[PDB]
Design a protein around this ligand. Structure first.
Ligand SMILES: *[C@@H]1O[C@H](CO)[C@@H](O[C@@H]2O[C@H](CO)[C@@H](O)[C@H](O)[C@H]2NC(C)=O)[C@H](O)[C@H]1NC(C)=O
Ligand SMILES: *[C@@H]1O[C@H](CO)[C@@H](O)[C@H](O)[C@H]1NC(C)=O
Lengths: 21, 48
């Protein structure tokens, strides 16, 4: 995420990680 | 400013760089090809 112009910072939710862990 | 939306109803604004990316998607090209090369495509277009 350093070549596209206009990127914003946000969280991407992975459904496996919480339930799995 | 609105691509092709105004011909089917109300004009819906969207940034032009994003309009071009949808147009590459319509021909089977993945949309990151524009977003990572936006300057190259715009400069090459302007000369063409
Ligand atoms: C999006 O997040 C990244 C990572 O946290 C930010 O990059 C940091 O930016 C600060 C200045 O705002 C620098 O001091 C850090 O060195 C940067 N970190 C890295 C790893 O490069 C980035 O600035 C954020 N973007 C926005 C618009 O806030
Ligand atoms: C959008 O334009 C503003 C000025 O109106 C500029 O400050 C900003 O960097 C531009 N955003 C992008 C993603 O180029």
């Amino acid at each position: 995420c350093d070549v596209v112009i206009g990127i914003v910072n946000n969280t991407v939710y992975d459904p496996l990680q919480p339930e799995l862990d | 400013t609105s691509g092709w939306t105004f011909g089917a109803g109300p004009a819906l604004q969207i940034p032009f760089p994003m309009q071009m990316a949808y147009r590459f998607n319509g021909i089977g090209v993945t949309q990151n090809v524009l977003y990572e090369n936006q300057k190259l495509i715009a400069n090459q277009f302007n000369s063409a």
